[PDB]
RNA sequence: GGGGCAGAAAAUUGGGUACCG
RNA sequence: GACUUAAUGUCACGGUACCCAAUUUUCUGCCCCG
């Protein structure tokens, strides 16, 4: 009777932790105390436990498997270990057989749900065949109560997903008020093969997906259902993919005030499905051109909606620095909302439109599709008012880029031959940016790039010919992280020229002695407060400092000024008077963003924070050059502020990759980040 | 067509792994992780023995890496012939993948060898790779290999049976440490193999083409690392003793258990382990501590009879039986066996279950992503190799963690924390700890870095990993093989200020001043500024101290090393690569490079002259120097200091219970340790003092748990999830040379409340350091503060330092009786300015109450009455116990805290004897057995012990407050415990509450709230002079024998009378005029000669209180000074009349948590008046307070009433009967003997009990 | 006619930690 | 010459056994009748 009262004090704590009015920070401690007292009971009565306590141990293992969050991009080992221990602790209860009749139902229910979660998060250890056999035995032991037990619905839906016929169970499945829209849609699709009712239930699921946060399990199950619908070549996966994309967009608009979204692994592949769906509604024969142009515009809106925010990890969110205390409340509100949604799943100003481009400009949106392994370039032309798209492959381009990155990080100036090879590989991979039909001649081009193509010099592309032509010799190149960063009415409104300097190694003594530099905040040994002390919107700001890249948080990447320097977050909060200000940075981009190892990176430098403040354009260096070239750019900008950067790049000798690759290395490094 | 024989030798402990062929290798995690290690195969059946080897594929991989690096150094050519780039890709369509895939970058060059390589003619690199051979990817026959690498067998020097795994390898858990939290992420295990005896391997390499012979023989000497160790490649042309120890341990445990002393065995185990610190002579020549002299029972534990013989003699026979295993192994095995038998006999065997798994992670393979990344250096580039040779010195005791024994067994306790050691019991700094500390300091110097990701198909391109991939280190083994030091640690409950349950543990530390070699190698094009800054940060110069934190107790300040004797040498690899191949890069001979002169350096190795100093380095002084700031101070303690050790006291001569803590310091000039140990206060102790001060000031000690907590205490001092932001070091005594007899012997005893004498088995000694107010001790201490501290946290640390200076937190043990009281603090000039500024910016009172004394005995008849010297106080036997016990976790706002400064005046001569010297003045040369003493003094300054004043005030307070008998003995004559009431029994446990005396002065499981300091002599005439004595002072006392309860309680139906008190009388003049009649007619062994102080002398002492209620402070102020004509009794010779003292309250200060008050005379009367109402409320029978209204207080105060203070020529006669007439000292016709006063005819018993219970009742007329 | 006591009682370990597409 | 490698491709020198805890609480060197 000591085991009885210890099990009841553990079962009270388990059901209090299983209450949807409990905060998760309390839930972890409560469920660990209950698991502690059950584990101590096991330690003292090692092999003489009843099955009634074994089911409590297995339920505690299921509940700790719920509250273990992925702090990165991989499933943690603790969740798999918790599910494994619950499986064997229920296995000894099954080997303790011939107890009560309801105990067999409860034990096989706990076993089947634990095996379902293990098969979901680890397919190799928990196969489909063993799961099919166990869930087959579970309904043989009478686990078909769809009206008082939520988990029996999951058993039936997983079983009909596996392949066995459940035509008898269907009428008992549908009338339950514990079933939800996605389960009813899977029941209508997999058992009765009804497309018509499943479409209505899936649209109801899509409509309910609007108000639930992305950490909820409904998103994972929905994207898995759409991936299964694409797996058997169904006709309904395209519409469901576009509906789920629209729901994800309107949900992602509702996130906390920073450019942040929750990371879940399927969030990419949903976009990678939805893009493909619109693509299959374009290349497949559509008789009217006006719907096809709308589809090619929808592709460029899908890519921009992906490129807006950058999806931080969980450990970086917990290690977030503290400043602007109301935004601290907003960020912790976002974090607790996401974690509460994750466990709640188991406990039961003006964006410029894509056609608002000035005359004589061409906009190139990029997308890297990891499902099909392709790269899509979508071009919008304002003079013709047309939309087109082309494909390329990015594997060998990624290879040559990683070769240049390794050679650069070892021998910074002497990687010029690898830079010429990378530029020729960009020109050979993408011939469509040298033909007249895709990009017209003499027209300004704004690139809106994606993934590792952000770090590629697109202006230095060499055409696949013998007398190879550089790309910047005919077009004016501009860059942008996403189309949501573009603005209207730059409004510089002043004429003051401001300089900041912190480092003394670079021989800028002749630059700081110049007459033109304005009356406020021109320094030597500048600090972060001096950057925050800009009064009213200067014409040109020049920040000369070293750069520091935090390898996990872009919010902790900082510019090396005095007394600790200024970070991305301190830029986004503290500096106010820089609306419509041309900025020139002395820090290279390789010191501002970390080097990358995967094909996908979403990392924003301080130039994007400067654009979010309201600056009109930021001119920087992609990699490290000597101080004389940056001084020459600053002096040419001071003498000529209106003139374009590709003219200076052509005049300095940047068209001579064949004879002097150091000059080509120093010339094409300069990139403007803005949209005039 | 000629074979060559290759010998591979190691100079570091290499790595071993179990052998699985190709698919069972994929089945296991350790096999896939250890693919570049040595392989172990089991031989026979039983899984006990086998043999190790190195596969030829691994040696081939190292060889082709050396060939690639040699050709990349010399622009793609070797000895004039050019080599092409080679092939390192394999198409999947034609052939399979070659069983290992390369992830690193491949060095390439401009290939100009006039031709493309075909089967007919090929370059030396192409035939050395084995491209155009007949066999590939499936082994058919050992011929048709152009170059063939055989398996490298372990060159066992002498042939024997099958080699066991435990004789070569030893497992060890390695770690991954998070940079941001200072905590481990996960761990993994590996096998480290012996290299001193099993570090030579032999194999064969077969070439069939005399065109790649020069390149192969050149690159064999360029291979530097294999199997996790530095290597050279050359070409040639007591299980039985344990069981008897277990049986003798069984005999010892059973002999202890028969004597009901089982729990000593645990202590004994530790003592036997401490016997490894001393030599064998401590058992041989009987250096173990003997018992007290002329005592039938010997030592506390070393004279316990085991099979009729003492434990020292049994240990001597056990050592004589086992002389062949050595002293150290004998003591360690004996202690381990005794601990194992004790843990078996107790019944708890330490289960150690882990929920949610066991965080042991091995790195994993993801398919796809097969990349070939070529790296081409520039033509002109100049590559060099820098070797830094130096010496690590431990500036603090160090700690390198390792698992428990019987867990580092590769095939399949007593000390909680062991230290990493070699096979010859030498201290070891492993390569992995140096590599992790270098990675951490390089991430600090660069400012950015990566957390080390384990599953990777693409090499990380951060600056830290790029510089670390060309840094090679070497493990260091000291030249010292003496055993570690066991340091004990406890934890404190903040509520009761006592030890928590299960909080004792022990750590093994290494000696400070120890010395290890240090080798660093960097191969590259330019020496980095950040690596130079890390080396300059680690090393020490004049003024600067080294900051190399290695090891695993950094918050306790353990493991701060300093680099010295730094010599950096440069090797030119572009011009003098042949000398590198010839000299093997000085691998294994770096010891010779330190003592090498300039003219003895090899060709190619030059000194490096362009090594930047500290001031010229940019990442230094901006990233590394402000990382930790030093705050160094000096505590001045003007009281005795005792941080008890209690295990080494059991193994040292002197027979002392508690001794001070000592350290072992190692010296490098002479290879011994030190002749004399250095006294210290541990870093754990003052770390806990700072932590408790900050936690009580803010209120974070009151929380029930600190998991996932972000309070100020957990931010400053660390928690489970984070490392501490402050690191504490030891407080070392620096003025120990100014003292004569630095350690003082101070002995104490517990006095029974009824008999008035010493309680049985309640006498003890202490040996603290002699601290006096005019000659204080000075302890120099240090702590380091990490950058990032806010103004509030710096304010908190300076407030804690001010609390330590103000005397709120005494050091060591026995702080409530005046030990370890801080008298002052000093702050050095190297402390920063803000910390210095915060630390620098921080009448006749009487009681006027006259008691009406007993008027019937003395104020009626003047000098014709004889009173008994002791009377008994009887109370109502109803005590009030409070279960809401005031806790020590915070300074409560309603309650009072501060100090009372008081002065003590002697009405009568005072005897406080110094029992440190039993010979004292002189006078044992004249006669043997005569005990004579001096007054109690520390360093010549006369003092009263604080324990005496505390016991006197407690014996007054419990009588005033009707408390239980705190010190009481239940003994011979049923027992005295049966006659005593249950309410007056001593309070055991907090469940039934605490009486007010035990609430204020504390119990075992609750610390007291009043602390009594040592009193110091100030003014007056010392040394009451008597002419007929051998000194001018110091009169000789008479007999003093033990009190008998049988006179107090005869005829069993008679209950205990009460607490015994002694009257105030000038009976000392009778002793003063009987000095000639005391030396004769009394045996000289019986009586004692003691130094005496005259009346009128003044002493000064202070009482510190905290968390006091108002009535408790009022009752304390009343017990300190009850009124006019009321005094206390203190010291020796209380029945003879010595020791009446009167205490005046000079001042009272009360503080709040931020100023010091004065509290004028009106409020202390309010406190005493509030205290009086509590006794009125407790009595039940409900103005300046008249204390005689309450019944027991009047009976108490007439006992404490002095009859000669205000003029009265009242001089009462107070003495004992003289047994039998005919006895010396008889008064003429008194009829005053115990024969006529105790015989149930004359004085009827009950009348005698009435006579002993009514104070100042006349006894010779016997009213 | 005579000396006793010379240490006693607790705690002797508890937990924590698995970034890597 | 088996035990015991596969050969045109092994970053394991790719990973600090790391973090948290005051040897401390209570005790007058004291004392008379078989
Ligand atoms: Zn070749
Ligand atoms: Zn790295
Ligand atoms: Zn806390
Ligand atoms: Zn009590």
PDB file of C-alpha atoms in Angstrom, chain B residues 617-781:
ATOM      1  CA  UNK B 617      50.086  43.138 -29.296  1.00  0.00           C
ATOM      2  CA  UNK B 618      46.678  44.296 -30.510  1.00  0.00           C
ATOM      3  CA  UNK B 619      44.425  41.403 -29.296  1.00  0.00           C
ATOM      4  CA  UNK B 620      46.263  41.453 -25.986  1.00  0.00           C
ATOM      5  CA  UNK B 621      45.280  44.376 -23.687  1.00  0.00           C
ATOM      6  CA  UNK B 622      41.933  44.670 -25.531  1.00  0.00           C
ATOM      7  CA  UNK B 623      40.625  41.107 -25.228  1.00  0.00           C
ATOM      8  CA  UNK B 624      42.877  39.077 -22.929  1.00  0.00           C
ATOM      9  CA  UNK B 625      44.144  41.472 -20.243  1.00  0.00           C
ATOM     10  CA  UNK B 626      40.702  42.839 -19.163  1.00  0.00           C
ATOM     11  CA  UNK B 627      39.314  39.274 -18.987  1.00  0.00           C
ATOM     12  CA  UNK B 628      39.991  38.864 -15.253  1.00  0.00           C
ATOM     13  CA  UNK B 629      40.698  41.601 -12.705  1.00  0.00           C
ATOM     14  CA  UNK B 630      42.592  40.917  -9.483  1.00  0.00           C
ATOM     15  CA  UNK B 631      41.351  42.130  -6.098  1.00  0.00           C
ATOM     16  CA  UNK B 632      43.928  41.370  -3.407  1.00  0.00           C
ATOM     17  CA  UNK B 633      43.482  42.127   0.280  1.00  0.00           C
ATOM     18  CA  UNK B 634      44.820  41.301   3.733  1.00  0.00           C
ATOM     19  CA  UNK B 635      42.643  40.167   6.640  1.00  0.00           C
ATOM     20  CA  UNK B 636      43.934  41.060  10.111  1.00  0.00           C
ATOM     21  CA  UNK B 637      42.646  38.627  12.754  1.00  0.00           C
ATOM     22  CA  UNK B 638      43.231  39.531  16.390  1.00  0.00           C
ATOM     23  CA  UNK B 639      41.797  36.316  17.828  1.00  0.00           C
ATOM     24  CA  UNK B 640      42.767  32.622  17.690  1.00  0.00           C
ATOM     25  CA  UNK B 641      42.146  31.002  14.307  1.00  0.00           C
ATOM     26  CA  UNK B 642      41.152  27.353  13.912  1.00  0.00           C
ATOM     27  CA  UNK B 643      40.187  25.778  10.598  1.00  0.00           C
ATOM     28  CA  UNK B 644      40.096  22.212  11.870  1.00  0.00           C
ATOM     29  CA  UNK B 645      41.656  19.328   9.958  1.00  0.00           C
ATOM     30  CA  UNK B 646      40.941  16.302  12.245  1.00  0.00           C
ATOM     31  CA  UNK B 647      42.345  13.596   9.951  1.00  0.00           C
ATOM     32  CA  UNK B 648      45.981  14.696  10.008  1.00  0.00           C
ATOM     33  CA  UNK B 649      45.593  15.228  13.752  1.00  0.00           C
ATOM     34  CA  UNK B 650      45.026  11.461  13.980  1.00  0.00           C
ATOM     35  CA  UNK B 651      48.340  10.812  12.166  1.00  0.00           C
ATOM     36  CA  UNK B 652      50.644  13.349  13.864  1.00  0.00           C
ATOM     37  CA  UNK B 653      52.336  13.386  17.284  1.00  0.00           C
ATOM     38  CA  UNK B 654      50.976  15.522  20.086  1.00  0.00           C
ATOM     39  CA  UNK B 655      47.590  13.846  20.702  1.00  0.00           C
ATOM     40  CA  UNK B 656      45.488  16.858  19.775  1.00  0.00           C
ATOM     41  CA  UNK B 657      41.854  16.797  18.723  1.00  0.00           C
ATOM     42  CA  UNK B 658      41.608  19.721  16.290  1.00  0.00           C
ATOM     43  CA  UNK B 659      44.650  21.285  14.621  1.00  0.00           C
ATOM     44  CA  UNK B 660      44.995  24.036  12.046  1.00  0.00           C
ATOM     45  CA  UNK B 661      44.995  23.396   8.312  1.00  0.00           C
ATOM     46  CA  UNK B 662      48.336  23.150   6.512  1.00  0.00           C
ATOM     47  CA  UNK B 663      49.417  23.016   2.874  1.00  0.00           C
ATOM     48  CA  UNK B 664      52.206  21.316   0.965  1.00  0.00           C
ATOM     49  CA  UNK B 665      54.126  23.682  -1.312  1.00  0.00           C
ATOM     50  CA  UNK B 666      56.576  22.334  -3.882  1.00  0.00           C
ATOM     51  CA  UNK B 667      59.852  24.154  -4.517  1.00  0.00           C
ATOM     52  CA  UNK B 668      61.612  24.074  -7.882  1.00  0.00           C
ATOM     53  CA  UNK B 669      65.126  25.046  -6.799  1.00  0.00           C
ATOM     54  CA  UNK B 670      65.379  21.906  -4.674  1.00  0.00           C
ATOM     55  CA  UNK B 671      63.307  18.922  -5.766  1.00  0.00           C
ATOM     56  CA  UNK B 672      61.862  18.285  -2.286  1.00  0.00           C
ATOM     57  CA  UNK B 673      58.593  19.885  -1.235  1.00  0.00           C
ATOM     58  CA  UNK B 674      59.293  22.156   1.795  1.00  0.00           C
ATOM     59  CA  UNK B 675      60.674  21.480   5.289  1.00  0.00           C
ATOM     60  CA  UNK B 676      57.718  23.110   7.061  1.00  0.00           C
ATOM     61  CA  UNK B 677      54.088  23.401   5.915  1.00  0.00           C
ATOM     62  CA  UNK B 678      52.349  26.704   5.304  1.00  0.00           C
ATOM     63  CA  UNK B 679      49.214  27.565   7.254  1.00  0.00           C
ATOM     64  CA  UNK B 680      46.233  28.714   5.231  1.00  0.00           C
ATOM     65  CA  UNK B 681      42.514  29.370   5.161  1.00  0.00           C
ATOM     66  CA  UNK B 682      41.028  27.433   2.257  1.00  0.00           C
ATOM     67  CA  UNK B 683      39.594  29.019  -0.882  1.00  0.00           C
ATOM     68  CA  UNK B 684      36.345  27.083  -0.368  1.00  0.00           C
ATOM     69  CA  UNK B 685      35.944  28.711   3.049  1.00  0.00           C
ATOM     70  CA  UNK B 686      36.162  32.361   2.072  1.00  0.00           C
ATOM     71  CA  UNK B 687      34.337  31.660  -1.192  1.00  0.00           C
ATOM     72  CA  UNK B 688      31.503  30.392   0.996  1.00  0.00           C
ATOM     73  CA  UNK B 689      31.869  33.427   3.274  1.00  0.00           C
ATOM     74  CA  UNK B 690      31.453  35.792   0.309  1.00  0.00           C
ATOM     75  CA  UNK B 691      28.575  33.716  -1.081  1.00  0.00           C
ATOM     76  CA  UNK B 692      26.743  33.628   2.262  1.00  0.00           C
ATOM     77  CA  UNK B 693      27.302  37.369   2.776  1.00  0.00           C
ATOM     78  CA  UNK B 694      25.887  38.292  -0.651  1.00  0.00           C
ATOM     79  CA  UNK B 695      23.017  35.815  -0.292  1.00  0.00           C
ATOM     80  CA  UNK B 696      22.024  37.113   3.130  1.00  0.00           C
ATOM     81  CA  UNK B 697      22.299  40.734   1.999  1.00  0.00           C
ATOM     82  CA  UNK B 698      20.115  40.320  -1.094  1.00  0.00           C
ATOM     83  CA  UNK B 699      17.867  37.516   0.144  1.00  0.00           C
ATOM     84  CA  UNK B 700      18.665  34.772  -2.379  1.00  0.00           C
ATOM     85  CA  UNK B 701      19.629  32.201   0.265  1.00  0.00           C
ATOM     86  CA  UNK B 702      15.968  31.975   1.273  1.00  0.00           C
ATOM     87  CA  UNK B 703      14.898  30.427  -2.031  1.00  0.00           C
ATOM     88  CA  UNK B 704      14.126  26.718  -2.007  1.00  0.00           C
ATOM     89  CA  UNK B 705      15.839  25.953  -5.324  1.00  0.00           C
ATOM     90  CA  UNK B 706      18.213  27.540  -7.834  1.00  0.00           C
ATOM     91  CA  UNK B 707      17.574  25.432 -10.937  1.00  0.00           C
ATOM     92  CA  UNK B 708      16.901  27.761 -13.904  1.00  0.00           C
ATOM     93  CA  UNK B 709      17.523  30.758 -11.652  1.00  0.00           C
ATOM     94  CA  UNK B 710      18.881  34.179 -12.589  1.00  0.00           C
ATOM     95  CA  UNK B 711      19.215  35.824  -9.179  1.00  0.00           C
ATOM     96  CA  UNK B 712      22.188  38.022  -8.310  1.00  0.00           C
ATOM     97  CA  UNK B 713      23.766  35.287  -6.186  1.00  0.00           C
ATOM     98  CA  UNK B 714      23.553  32.776  -9.041  1.00  0.00           C
ATOM     99  CA  UNK B 715      24.800  35.356 -11.546  1.00  0.00           C
ATOM    100  CA  UNK B 716      27.854  36.281  -9.470  1.00  0.00           C
ATOM    101  CA  UNK B 717      28.728  32.906  -7.934  1.00  0.00           C
ATOM    102  CA  UNK B 718      27.452  30.523 -10.611  1.00  0.00           C
ATOM    103  CA  UNK B 719      24.826  27.808 -10.574  1.00  0.00           C
ATOM    104  CA  UNK B 720      24.103  24.501 -12.289  1.00  0.00           C
ATOM    105  CA  UNK B 721      23.724  26.082 -15.731  1.00  0.00           C
ATOM    106  CA  UNK B 722      26.503  28.701 -15.617  1.00  0.00           C
ATOM    107  CA  UNK B 723      30.056  29.040 -14.359  1.00  0.00           C
ATOM    108  CA  UNK B 724      30.976  31.493 -11.624  1.00  0.00           C
ATOM    109  CA  UNK B 725      31.922  35.043 -12.560  1.00  0.00           C
ATOM    110  CA  UNK B 726      34.268  35.261  -9.552  1.00  0.00           C
ATOM    111  CA  UNK B 727      37.179  32.974  -8.651  1.00  0.00           C
ATOM    112  CA  UNK B 728      38.608  32.776  -5.139  1.00  0.00           C
ATOM    113  CA  UNK B 729      42.052  31.760  -3.898  1.00  0.00           C
ATOM    114  CA  UNK B 730      43.583  30.779  -0.576  1.00  0.00           C
ATOM    115  CA  UNK B 731      44.229  33.063   2.389  1.00  0.00           C
ATOM    116  CA  UNK B 732      47.855  32.381   3.316  1.00  0.00           C
ATOM    117  CA  UNK B 733      49.377  33.428   6.635  1.00  0.00           C
ATOM    118  CA  UNK B 734      52.185  35.902   5.982  1.00  0.00           C
ATOM    119  CA  UNK B 735      53.401  36.978   9.460  1.00  0.00           C
ATOM    120  CA  UNK B 736      54.036  33.525  10.897  1.00  0.00           C
ATOM    121  CA  UNK B 737      57.718  34.322  11.390  1.00  0.00           C
ATOM    122  CA  UNK B 738      57.015  37.102  13.911  1.00  0.00           C
ATOM    123  CA  UNK B 739      55.556  34.672  16.461  1.00  0.00           C
ATOM    124  CA  UNK B 740      57.130  32.492  19.098  1.00  0.00           C
ATOM    125  CA  UNK B 741      54.947  29.398  19.681  1.00  0.00           C
ATOM    126  CA  UNK B 742      52.564  30.171  16.814  1.00  0.00           C
ATOM    127  CA  UNK B 743      50.133  27.434  17.870  1.00  0.00           C
ATOM    128  CA  UNK B 744      48.432  27.770  21.262  1.00  0.00           C
ATOM    129  CA  UNK B 745      46.885  24.924  23.272  1.00  0.00           C
ATOM    130  CA  UNK B 746      43.442  25.884  24.614  1.00  0.00           C
ATOM    131  CA  UNK B 747      41.397  23.272  26.457  1.00  0.00           C
ATOM    132  CA  UNK B 748      37.699  23.232  27.298  1.00  0.00           C
ATOM    133  CA  UNK B 749      35.236  21.172  29.314  1.00  0.00           C
ATOM    134  CA  UNK B 750      31.446  20.965  29.599  1.00  0.00           C
ATOM    135  CA  UNK B 751      30.135  21.657  33.110  1.00  0.00           C
ATOM    136  CA  UNK B 752      27.150  19.756  34.489  1.00  0.00           C
ATOM    137  CA  UNK B 753      24.285  22.007  35.519  1.00  0.00           C
ATOM    138  CA  UNK B 754      23.396  20.003  38.642  1.00  0.00           C
ATOM    139  CA  UNK B 755      26.707  18.755  40.055  1.00  0.00           C
ATOM    140  CA  UNK B 756      28.597  21.881  39.021  1.00  0.00           C
ATOM    141  CA  UNK B 757      31.603  19.817  37.945  1.00  0.00           C
ATOM    142  CA  UNK B 758      32.978  18.385  34.740  1.00  0.00           C
ATOM    143  CA  UNK B 759      30.760  16.074  32.727  1.00  0.00           C
ATOM    144  CA  UNK B 760      32.025  12.618  31.827  1.00  0.00           C
ATOM    145  CA  UNK B 761      33.759  12.274  28.407  1.00  0.00           C
ATOM    146  CA  UNK B 762      33.234  15.995  27.814  1.00  0.00           C
ATOM    147  CA  UNK B 763      36.802  17.322  27.997  1.00  0.00           C
ATOM    148  CA  UNK B 764      38.651  18.410  24.880  1.00  0.00           C
ATOM    149  CA  UNK B 765      41.460  20.499  23.438  1.00  0.00           C
ATOM    150  CA  UNK B 766      42.053  22.832  20.508  1.00  0.00           C
ATOM    151  CA  UNK B 767      45.283  23.955  18.842  1.00  0.00           C
ATOM    152  CA  UNK B 768      44.557  27.244  17.033  1.00  0.00           C
ATOM    153  CA  UNK B 769      47.016  29.852  15.831  1.00  0.00           C
ATOM    154  CA  UNK B 770      47.991  32.369  18.507  1.00  0.00           C
ATOM    155  CA  UNK B 771      46.145  35.560  17.646  1.00  0.00           C
ATOM    156  CA  UNK B 772      46.080  38.494  20.064  1.00  0.00           C
ATOM    157  CA  UNK B 773      44.782  42.077  19.737  1.00  0.00           C
ATOM    158  CA  UNK B 774      48.275  43.560  20.062  1.00  0.00           C
ATOM    159  CA  UNK B 775      49.904  40.929  17.797  1.00  0.00           C
ATOM    160  CA  UNK B 776      47.382  39.868  15.152  1.00  0.00           C
ATOM    161  CA  UNK B 777      47.607  37.346  12.336  1.00  0.00           C
ATOM    162  CA  UNK B 778      47.735  38.568   8.737  1.00  0.00           C
ATOM    163  CA  UNK B 779      46.249  36.525   5.885  1.00  0.00           C
ATOM    164  CA  UNK B 780      46.791  37.629   2.285  1.00  0.00           C
ATOM    165  CA  UNK B 781      44.016  36.628  -0.104  1.00  0.00           C
TER     166      UNK B 781
END
